[PDB]
Structure formats: C-alpha cells, structure tokens
Design a protein around this ligand. Structure first.
Ligand SMILES: [Mg+2]
Ligand SMILES: [Mg+2]
Ligand SMILES: [Mg+2]
Lengths: 149, 149, 149
C-alpha cells in the first residue's frame, strides 16, 4: 500500500547509499552483505558476475588501484513489483583517484537494478550499469544507455 | 494533507527524473509529453519558449550537437500551492559531450519550476533555469541566480 | 512513528537544501539561522567553530574569495534519535569558482551531522565534514573519511 511503498522507498535508497558509502570506504564485506547469493551484476557485455562469490571477486583491488573514490547517487526511480521486490533506475557520478599517476577517472552512469527484501533487509538481486560516458577512465568496455540516434 | 503531500513529492521527483532520463536518451517526444500546452520555459532573459510547440523546437539538435549528456538532479525542494500545483526549486549538474571536438561542457544550475497535476500526471507548467556557473559551455546568455554581492 | 519519521526526513532534507542554496547565494544570515547557539562545526582536526558566533565568522569572505559556488547534496541517510534529534550522513559535491585566477576548486565530501528540531524548525547542532578528496582546492587540512587500507 501507500504507507508500505513510502517506507520501503526510503529503505531502498538508504541501502543504495550504504552501498556507495562502503564502496568509498573500501569495505568489501559490507558491500557483499548487500547482495543475495543468487545475484547478477553486469558492467559490460562481457564483464560482470554471476553469484555473490564472483561479485566479491570484482571488489578485489579497490584499496590498491585507487587512493579514493566518491560516488554520488541521484535521480532514483523505484517501481515496486511487490512489497519485497522492486525495480530501480538511477543516475551515478563516480570519481576515481588512482594510485598510479593519471587524471581522476569519471564515470557518468545509470543503474538498472532489481532489489529484494529478505529478513528485513533490502539487497541487490541484479545490478546493470549502463555507461552514459566517461572521462579519463580505466574501463573501456561498457553497456550503452541506448541513446536514440 | 500529509499523506497526499508525501506521495505527490515522490511523483513530482519521479517526473523530474523521467525528464532528465529521456533528455539523456534523446527522446524529445517523451520530454514534450511532460509539459502542458500553455507552458513557459526560460533559459535566459532573451531565450526560452512560450507554449509547448515552441518548447518542442528547443529540443531540435539534441541528437546531432551532442554525443551524450548526463543530468544529475538533486536538492529538490517542493512547496505545494494545492494538491495539483507545486513550486519546486532544485539543483542540476549537466555534462555535455559535444559532437564537435571540444571539452565537455558543464552546467551548474538551479531550476525554479511550477508543476501541475493533470489526469493523474505531473507536468511542467513553467521552468526557469538559473545558471550558477558553467565550464567550457556552449551557451553564453543566462538567467543569474541572484547571488548577493 | 512512521508518519513522523517520513515527514521529518523531508523537513531535514529541505533544511539541508535550504542551507546549500543560501550558501551558493551568499546569504550568511540565513545560514546562521539554521544553527543552534550551542553548535559545533568541524572542517579539520584544527579547524572549525564552537558556537554560533564562531560559525558566523567562518562565513566571512564567501562573497569576496569566490565568484560562485555550487553545492550538490545527495546520498542522505537519516537515523532518528528521537522525533526532535537525528543523526545524518550525506555526500557533497561542492564546486568553487575563485575570485583569483585559478582553476575551479572541487570538494568531494561526506557530512556527518546532528540536527535538532526547535520551535518547528530543524537546525544543525553539529556538522562534521570529512573530505574524501579534493581537486585544485584552497584548503589543505581535512578530516579524513577513514577509508580502509
Ligand atoms: Mg561462501
Ligand atoms: Mg500540435
Ligand atoms: Mg549575538
């Protein structure tokens, strides 16, 4: 209902923010706690993770290849399938300060997510990053946003 | 009432996000569907649109002059006139990757909007962009924010 | 309760946005009206303000040292202590266009705040800025975010 939808929108947004916080803090175990076992992550047509352990592996090196990151998540649009499943579209600005000497790398992106509520906690079941564009960035492959020509 | 205000704040924000999404996707018809016929848009003291058809014309070339854009909308403040009319103030970060060879153009702005609810959908009745500042941008004229000196 | 929490989350966010607006507008008296007398502000281990008058002093020169600023506040996480006291964590992107000839200065930060509700208005009781990183910026000292190594 209305009440349920409003409260859960807040909870979903909070989880997404906790995710970005723990990412900028280099807390990979906290990050993995926000994904179900049977998850999928897609960062490019030939790059992602199937299942939580594979996802954990994608987190390796956050602490070593970057001196810092800053994630700014906005434009969050939530459509409930049910009270324990929602589809989310959002915008991300992610700045990366590398450990190697090179300009900061900027990702302008969209996330297409499905989140599920389990034992009182929202978690990611699927995340699909679509890359709007990048600057001085370290990843070449990407899922396009599908901009009309 | 309280309940009404909360639900409609979510709906207004969703519409604003759908707008920015369809803009970054180069979907001008979806954009125009989010404006009433009797709308006004102001981007500079001598630049805007009176009525929806004129607004549609301002969308020409999105696909040709830019390879991509990314809009990040935040700091959304909503004051209800009534349950079907609200005044909104918000902040925008808009990055533009040009089709011509030149640095990305950055707009730091404020939107002063009036939105109205018609047949279940929020739409823009007025948008006024105030330009806080810009970098490497393609538009010179602007409405100032009115910063105190 | 639920209803209270939702309404007050909106009010707290609104206050935070009003703060950033008045800051970008160079309105120091409006800013100071959003702090209690017995406040604390921490921007670095050896830099801040104890009490509202000291805070007011930190606002001196906004109009003179910058031609403009733009603050984008996102990722707002609110934990209520009570219905009139909350702890907030948020992300900030703050761009500064200097009056002196130098590149824009960018702050990527986190705010750790305690807000209190007094006579119907949320106000800051404590703000602690943690600096994720900066670019071409004018402040060297900072409170670290505490990123895991
Ligand atoms: Mg295991
Ligand atoms: Mg017609
Ligand atoms: Mg006094």
């Amino acid at each position: 209902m209305t009440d349920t939808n409003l409260v859960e929108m807040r909870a979903i947004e909070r989880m997404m923010f906790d995710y970005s916080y723990h990412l900028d803090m280099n807390h990979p175990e906290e990050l993995a706690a926000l994904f179900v076992e049977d998850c999928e992550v897609s960062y490019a047509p030939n790059f992602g993770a199937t299942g939580r352990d594979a996802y954990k592996k994608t987190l390796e090196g956050i602490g070593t290849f970057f001196r810092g990151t800053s994630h700014h998540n906005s434009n969050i649009c939530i459509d409930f399938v049910s009270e324990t499943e929602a589809n989310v579209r959002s915008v991300v600005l992610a700045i990366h300060r590398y450990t190697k000497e090179r300009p900061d790398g900027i990702l302008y992106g969209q996330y297409f997510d499905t989140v599920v509520k389990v034992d009182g906690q929202w978690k990611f079941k699927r995340r699909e990053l679509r890359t709007t564009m990048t600057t001085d960035y370290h990843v070449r492959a990407a899922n396009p946003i599908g901009r009309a020509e």
